[PDB]
């Protein structure tokens, strides 16, 4: 039963456990080496978690890690046969088989924790799935800085132990929890390692600039990740705002009246919500053509396929019309169709409701159409100025129509004569 490395929803959650175990090792080995926390009262409980870490590391070499579908020449291999030998010849098996061999002590597990690519793969999966993935990078670099401080404190504790508790000025004692003491020391020395009247020796003053540079580098990385995250978060808001005040400045320059100004501002605000984009074509053009075609045939294909006007035509025709459908949002009480107008287009309803304002003297609803209803298709087979609209059609609220202009139909018809003859026969 070959599993999917992506979107399996269980492989990522098990990678979570594996990266947690790897972090446990990478954070506990320095502590076990430096601090004498491996007391007889805790050695057994630590070594139990050590056994579980060994077992989960084994699970990351064979079994579940054994199965992984991949792609070769476009073809997805998911037969549980060929990647049995692909993994053993891959780099993933190379960084393994040395991270698990038997060999507490500092050098005991330092070569036994080297899976830096499994955590990167877990990262990639997280940013693939998680929507708010920008902050994950900064929390990653925060963990990096905290691990740097952890190592700097473990080394300080080792130095103090090798020098003696109460030997020189910089050493500490073990009356309390020495871990937080050493962490405080490392943090303090990350910015405070100078002092003219304290020439310690020729090996401490020289590297103070080095540690200050490391701190400044990490701090600049912090600031850069914040700035990138803020920019990525506010890009869409800034673009929408900029378009809005550019239109507002244009209209104020041209002394546009207050009412139409309110209408266009309402359109801007209502389209910014529930869309996130001011227009959909700029997104679609960047898309692959087959993706666009599938989107068109999965959004509004069944609505146009049941239209009685285009019955019996081929599929390429209707596919191309779907590709040339243009979305539009109408405000409440907006005259979608006016009485005595050319009415060349063909609207379909995808969200909202529209009403045919008829009656004895007008301003009277005759019939309301809902999502999935088309109207005006009889005009698509007309000629120049020969389909004067019959009545008035008004949008009840905020409606979402799909317009298909007659000129686009003519252009599409240019390439299809066998459907053109049928359409002209229907018109006749």
């Amino acid at each position: 039963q070959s599993i999917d490395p992506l979107t399996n929803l269980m492989y990522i959650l098990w990678l979570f456990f594996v990266v947690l175990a790897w972090n446990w090792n990478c954070w506990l080995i320095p502590v076990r080496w430096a601090f004498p926390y491996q007391t007889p009262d805790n050695i057994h409980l630590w070594l139990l978690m050590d056994y579980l870490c060994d077992l989960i590391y084994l699970l990351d070499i064979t079994v579940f890690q054994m199965r992984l579908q991949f792609v070769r020449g476009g073809d997805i291999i998911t037969d549980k046969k060929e990647m049995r030998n692909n993994y053993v010849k891959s780099q993933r098996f190379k960084m393994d088989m040395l991270c698990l061999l038997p060999l507490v002590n500092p050098l005991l597990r330092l070569p036994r924790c080297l899976k830096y690519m499994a955590f990167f793969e877990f990262n990639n999966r997280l940013e693939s799935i998680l929507s708010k993935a920008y902050v994950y990078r900064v929390i990653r670099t925060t963990a990096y800085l905290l691990y740097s401080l952890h190592l700097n404190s473990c080394l300080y504790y080792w130095a103090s132990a090798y020098e003696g508790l109460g030997s020189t000025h910089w050493v500490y004692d073990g009356v309390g929890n020495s871990y937080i003491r050493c962490y405080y020391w490392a943090v303090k020395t990350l910015i405070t390692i100078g002092g003219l009247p304290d020439p310690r020796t020729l090996f401490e003053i020289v590297f103070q600039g080095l540690n200050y540079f490391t701190g400044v580098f990490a701090f600049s990385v912090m600031i850069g990740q914040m700035r990138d995250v803020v920019g990525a978060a506010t890009a869409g808001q800034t673009y929408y705002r900029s378009c809005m005040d550019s239109t507002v400045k244009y209209m104020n320059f041209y002394k546009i009246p207050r009412s139409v100004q309110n209408r266009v501002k309402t359109w801007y605000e209502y389209t910014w919500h529930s869309q996130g984009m001011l227009d959909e074509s700029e997104l679609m053009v960047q898309l692959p053509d087959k993706m666009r075609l599938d989107l068109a045939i999965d959004v509004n294909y069944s609505i146009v396929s049941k239209v009685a006007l285009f019955q019996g035509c081929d599929r390429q025709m209707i596919f191309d019309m779907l590709k040339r459908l243009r979305s539009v949002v109408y405000l409440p009480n907006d005259y979608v169709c006016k009485k005595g107008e050319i009415g060349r287009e063909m609207y379909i309803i995808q969200a909202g409701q529209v009403q045919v304002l008829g009656g004895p003297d007008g301003k009277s609803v005759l019939v309301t159409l809902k999502a999935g209803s088309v109207f005006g298709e009889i005009s698509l087979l007309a000629v120049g100025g020969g389909n004067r609209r019959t009545a008035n059609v008004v949008a009840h609220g905020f409606t979402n129509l799909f317009i298909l202009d007659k000129k686009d139909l003519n252009e599409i018809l240019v390439h299809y004569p066998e459907s053109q003859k049928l359409l002209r026969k229907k018109a006749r």
Binding site: Y183, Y184, I223, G224, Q225, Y330
Partner: protein
């Protein structure tokens, strides 16, 4: 009791050596957490004004990029100095009187109904004043209003000279054109805003006298900012 604690919190968030050492173990946790938390907020706020500042000066950045690209182009093409000063003055005018954005990309997102409304608000009376378009349907006049295209000129620029091929109709929105002779002097008439020319040549006429050919050299006195229909 409040202000000293506020100052101590400020010091603890900012620095680590400006306060007496946390002689008790539980105080070390407080100081370390304060340092990490404060560095987090400081990075966040620094990134915030960084992004804001980058956003504030961005139109200027693109405008300077356009100007630099222009100058490089006409540097490696040996364009004369007069044209150099003319285009530099043009970009100076664009930046000074804010006109960098064009009208076509400003309204590229609005639906056709709102575009039609704003467009008939901007110029419908002038189009109704046009002799040919006077007594025609409102739908046609709406169709002819969305097809206008802005064209902004500079002082001394020639909109058209005698003998040129005419396939446009020009309506002066906010400008002052003048009909000059072939020598450029001896002003004949001055066309203020709201007027138009080349309305008979925009439509083909059986046996027209001056077929698609201008019969008068007209130029801009100052800036023109007129609209054209093809």
């Amino acid at each position: 009791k409040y202000v000293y604690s506020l100052y101590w919190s400020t010091l603890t968030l900012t620095t680590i050596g400006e306060t007496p050492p946390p002689v008790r173990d539980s105080e070390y946790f407080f100081v370390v957490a304060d340092f990490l938390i404060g560095v987090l907020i400081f990075a966040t706020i620094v990134g915030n004004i960084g992004s804001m500042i980058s956003n504030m000066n961005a139109a200027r950045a693109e405008f300077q990029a356009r100007i630099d690209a222009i100058k490089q182009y006409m540097h490696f093409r040996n364009v004369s100095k007069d044209m150099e000063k003319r285009v530099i003055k043009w970009f100076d005018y664009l930046w000074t009187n804010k006109k960098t954005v064009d009208e076509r990309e400003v309204l590229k997102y609005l639906p056709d109904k709102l575009r039609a409304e704003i467009a008939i608000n901007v110029h419908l009376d002038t189009l109704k004043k046009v002799r040919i378009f006077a007594d025609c349907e409102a739908g046609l006049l709406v169709e002819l209003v969305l097809k206008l295209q802005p064209q902004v000129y500079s002082p001394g620029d020639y909109i058209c000279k005698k003998g040129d091929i005419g396939r446009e109709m020009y309506i002066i929105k906010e400008g002052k054109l003048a009909v000059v002779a072939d020598d450029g002097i001896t002003q004949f008439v001055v066309l203020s805003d709201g007027s138009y020319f080349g309305e008979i040549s925009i439509l083909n006429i059986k046996g027209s006298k001056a077929g698609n050919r201008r019969t008068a050299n007209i130029k801009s006195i100052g800036y023109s900012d007129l609209f054209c229909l093809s």
